[PDB]
Amino acid sequence: TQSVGEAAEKSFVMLASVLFAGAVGGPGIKMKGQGPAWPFNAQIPFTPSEFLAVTALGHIIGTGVILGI
Amino acid sequence: TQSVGEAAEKSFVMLASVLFAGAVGGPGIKMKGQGPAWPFNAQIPFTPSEFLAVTALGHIIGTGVILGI
Amino acid sequence: KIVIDKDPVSTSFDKWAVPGHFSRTLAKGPKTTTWIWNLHADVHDFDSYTSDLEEVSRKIFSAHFGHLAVVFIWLSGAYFHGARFSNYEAWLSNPTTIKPSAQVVWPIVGQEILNGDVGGGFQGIQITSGLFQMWRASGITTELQLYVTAIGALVMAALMLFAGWFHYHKAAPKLEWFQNAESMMNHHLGGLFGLGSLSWAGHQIHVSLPVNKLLDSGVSPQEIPLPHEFILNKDLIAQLYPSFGQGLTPFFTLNWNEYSDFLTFKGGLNPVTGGLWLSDSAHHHLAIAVLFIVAGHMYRTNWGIGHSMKEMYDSHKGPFTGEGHKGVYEIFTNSWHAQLSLNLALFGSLSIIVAHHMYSMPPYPYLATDYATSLCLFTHHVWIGGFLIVGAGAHAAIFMVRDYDPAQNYNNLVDRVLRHRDAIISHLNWVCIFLGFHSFGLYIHNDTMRALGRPQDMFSDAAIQLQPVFAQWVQGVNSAAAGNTAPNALANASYAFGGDIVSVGGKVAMMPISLGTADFLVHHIHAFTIHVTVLILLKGVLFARNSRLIPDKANLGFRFPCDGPGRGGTCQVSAWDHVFLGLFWMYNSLSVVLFHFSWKMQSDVWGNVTADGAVSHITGNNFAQGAITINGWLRDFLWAQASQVIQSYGSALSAYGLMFLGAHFIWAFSLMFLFSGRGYWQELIESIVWAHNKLKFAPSIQPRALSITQGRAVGVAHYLLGGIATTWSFFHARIISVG
Amino acid sequence: LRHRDAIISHLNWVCIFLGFHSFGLYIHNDTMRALGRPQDMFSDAAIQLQPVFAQWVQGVNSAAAGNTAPNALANASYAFGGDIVSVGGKVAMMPISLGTADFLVHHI
Amino acid sequence: IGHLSTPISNSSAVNGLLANLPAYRKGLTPRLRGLEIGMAHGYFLTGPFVELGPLRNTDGGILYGSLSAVGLVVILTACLALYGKANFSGSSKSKDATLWESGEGWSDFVSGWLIGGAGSVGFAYLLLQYI
């Protein structure tokens, strides 16, 4: 964090954790596609129901890494 | 401006100006609907080509109001 | 998903007057006196007469609200009688010396001598309920705050009683609303246990932490502030543990290490109160909440994500086990009885776990030194624990009698246990006879070596040593754990594994409980009597339907008295009688567990501390050689400690002397029912109804005897009525005086 | 044998990846000392490459005599941690420390 | 066959990222699918230059560091066009006519790459030096 903030570099750890979650938590979801769909009917390759879980899983893993380092 | 910042209350003047623009600059656009469409094919009741102009018109009107008061 | 029909049950009083409306056996009229008992016995088991799985599940659902009501009525009486008639402000002035008292007694014949001098300007019955040490941690400093509560426990009792009305008389749900297990498991984990401990974590910091920063500075119950000021005056709350200057922002930028004064991992006992650090219990119920709410999102509902339990049993199958757990998810979504036994077993076994975790870790300020309560708080939940567990053996057999299905259960885990049920029982049979000789017979060897004048040839310390080499090592890793494995703790999880004697004044809060040669014996007694209590209940469940004796036991139901004098004689064969048999063994089990407590806590834990710290115990360390014999269990423990309740007439402790006497009565009064049978007495009423037919008024209700299961049932319900209440006063009087 | 290219070609990559990020960290370190820029080399007083896994392993093995190996008096060795030992006037063993220069050679 | 049948070859949850990236995608025009690539590779390339550079602790580290990030991209759109001159000699028609087999949009790929390859680059310099 030589070019950024100390409470700004946590946001890279939290946002990677959402990508670290959904890359290997995403293909584990068995029943996908259950509603609701996206707000403006944007045909996007996941559901908001699923993607809210990944941001929830990423918020737990990111809490584990940030407090872990 | 009683419960916010001094450079934070400009953002209400700038974002109202985008809504002040497109409310009466929006119905003046004669040829609408020319491409491109939205990024994720979100069926939304304007085009990004048009909406970029409103944010551009709002950025000029907002510069006029902020420097005007 | 919400699915509800409207007004299924009308609020008409016509079924109040005429009793027995619910059965098709009843609503006819008692031609015998068995109908009076047949009504009161089969009232609440709604599966007996409502043959409709939707209808029974609504009767169960509303009646739980009624049981939610009667707690809140009883929680009102714990809160109104403490605001009104207690020495609580007298207890808040001097917590150590002054014993608690609520229930002042009325001025009539001499029952007002029970209002004895307790300390302060107050006289009453010394309470052993621990509410004074409970409410002190919660922060309740004036009687007024409690006053609203009992009101809030009354109005919530009315709200639940209306909810039992509304969710049955007006809007009672569908069967498919009850079979939605994953949405129920998600909400009870997340909302009930998660938020309900999260909100208690909030109350512990906003209300219960700050005043105990001040009461433990030794100032007053008067000049300390009130709870509503702690939220508002944010610099009153920033003087004590000065970390509320930053607020909710360290919770959100994840720099949680800036809560290092009111969120702690001390892990000891608060030495100015002998109890748990409330900053530890706050960080506790915080971590319990976040664990439970995260576990509240484990199961699958109509948003795709989540574990489905039905998909988890299929593909849990093994080569030993065949089909695995297939059908077992369908068991706990069709049978309320199997759902009761499984929920009871881990409710009662939890109730013994809390009793073990309270004496080694006192949760409350000045509960540790209050030996009047800290012995009673153990012995209550141990009895409540052992009672629900025999209930778990009960309603397991009721599921097996009728709600067992062999169609759903072919070569799965329920079926194969019944297909090697002799090998389960006969191996469990052997280990009882193993643990009877090699645990109880060691006491008999300790009598026939001691009475013969050979105290070198028994099993003791100064003889053949039966050392508990495992449990002495488990203390060796649970006491070296802190800072050696658990490095952020201050001390260990408790002081019982080792450490300094912590004392409040001259009374010991907690001290390291040694295990010696006698502790190997009495723990193996507990291993013996629990394994018998398992055996009678497991024989009742595994043979609930059929055996080599009777292949139609569940055709004869759950509760039928006998199959008569046939097959050599077959009495007490049913699934009910095994619960009847297992109630005494549970009484015999926990009574040793209570005895092992009430002596080792007196002899090896509690006592008076002099100024340098040299502890002197109550009986003064006589468990280590008294408790290895049957005689020392009678001489050094039972003869020595029964003194306090027979020299108590004319005292404030005198109804203890009465209940000690009064429960010796009703215990023997059982044996009139237990050792006897029916057909003597129903023959004897022929003589007693003759006295009213000689004088021409023998009643139209024919005066009857009890049924055979009833004579068993009354006999055990009066048996446990005595032996617990015998100990209940005996424990109360002894620890009040010398403890 | 039926996937032997996937073995070798991933092994080929991790060979080249290791040569760049171990030996090329010396050629970087050669140049920044030759160009007189010791703030740019990989050292302890510079851009540090700390062996945190080999210092956590060296930590947990040196704090095991008494926690997880109680009946051991001292540790498994004095190479993980602890006091030095002398015989005569020469050292028998002392904790071999692992810094940026030890990370740099262990990847070679 | 030609390929091998593991249990994880051609698995769905990795194919969902494979057939939805803006190089294998279905409907995007080669002016536009080079933008999403250039918006992607550009935003991180000013990562290493500004915290690992010759000057890091100056006015001055994000500014100069991010000149080299767009200074790298201009060597990349060069290397894209030399690939265009040497693989597409007249965009010789091939089996698929993708953006990648037969060219047909290569200087629309090249020009699309340079838009985000300067656009996303300074956006991080906005997000690093300010904000």
Ligand code: CLA
């Ligand atoms: C204190 C009186 C008493 C005693 C000694 C027993 C003894 C026993 N009960 Mg019984 N029980 C009792 C009261 C008693 N019960 C009462 C009042 C009830 C009514 C509720 C029951 C209901 C009950 C049920 C429901 C069950 C038992 C079972 C058992 C056996 C358990 C296994 C065992 O320990 O074997 C070892 C034996 C002993 C510990 C007995 C003492 C033996 C001494 C110490 C050793 C012998 C000395 C010497 C070698 C003898 C030979 C010399 C001599 C002949 C000259 C054991 C024989 C269970 C069973 O049978 O499981 C297999 C069982 O399921 N009992």
Ligand code: CLA
């Ligand atoms: C010191 C002399 C030397 C060097 C530098 C090499 C280098 C290599 N050998 Mg070779 N080898 C050598 C002697 C050497 N060998 C000898 C004497 C034998 C006879 C026994 C062999 C037999 C041998 C076999 C059998 C194999 C190798 C393989 C390799 C490659 C290993 C992977 C790697 O590290 O890539 C990364 C490259 C380096 C670490 C080289 C240094 C690069 C510097 C640090 C960076 C470049 C700086 C700058 C950007 C350069 C350009 C500047 C300019 C454009 C302005 C590497 C290219 C293996 C291979 O090919 O695996 C894939 C292999 O299997 N070699």
Ligand code: CLA
């Ligand atoms: C002989 C010709 C030559 C020249 C004049 C340079 C000059 C430079 N190299 Mg070196 N380098 C060269 C060959 C050359 N290199 C070769 C052949 C190799 C392989 C062995 C290297 C390996 C090397 C590495 C690994 C590094 C350098 C770095 C540097 C720079 C150090 C100061 C600096 O960054 O200011 C700070 C100023 C900036 C970072 C911005 C300066 C302007 C940039 C370069 C261009 C901005 C965009 C511009 C408008 C258009 C692109 C330019 C391009 C078309 C020429 C300096 C610009 C360092 C560096 O910082 O890389 C950028 C660095 O890390 N070089």
Ligand SMILES: CC1=C(/C=C/C(C)=C/C=C/C(C)=C/C=C/C=C(C)/C=C/C=C(C)/C=C/C2=C(C)CCCC2(C)C)C(C)(C)CCC1
């Ligand atoms: C951790 C992890 C991960 C991740 C990583 C990665 C993958 C990353 C990447 C990321 C990235 C790579 C990102 C991106 C972003 C971008 C951005 C966000 C940018 C922006 C842009 C823009 C903004 C542009 C536009 C423009 C132009 C073009 C021109 C005009 C103007 C402007 C500027 C507007 C994974 C999953 C592997 C796995 C697990 C772990």
Ligand SMILES: CC1=C(/C=C/C(C)=C/C=C/C(C)=C/C=C/C=C(C)/C=C/C=C(C)/C=C/C2=C(C)CCCC2(C)C)C(C)(C)CCC1
């Ligand atoms: C449910 C929920 C949620 C969500 C929500 C949100 C977040 C919201 C937001 C909000 C928002 C974000 C909103 C906004 C809105 C706005 C408005 C309301 C506006 C209005 C205005 C107007 C309209 C004006 C304008 C104008 C002008 C200025 C001039 C010209 C004309 C006009 C008129 C146009 C959350 C997540 C929390 C959680 C859970 C729950």
Ligand SMILES: CC1=C(C/C=C(\C)CCC[C@H](C)CCC[C@H](C)CCCC(C)C)C(=O)c2ccccc2C1=O
């Ligand atoms: C004594 C005895 C009886 C006889 C005892 C009976 C039938 C109970 C009679 C006593 C009860 C308590 C009488 C009920 C009292 C009236 C209800 C009084 C009404 C007055 C109002 C004011 C309440 C059995 O029936 C029996 C059956 C099986 C095994 C053992 C025994 C057994 O030992």
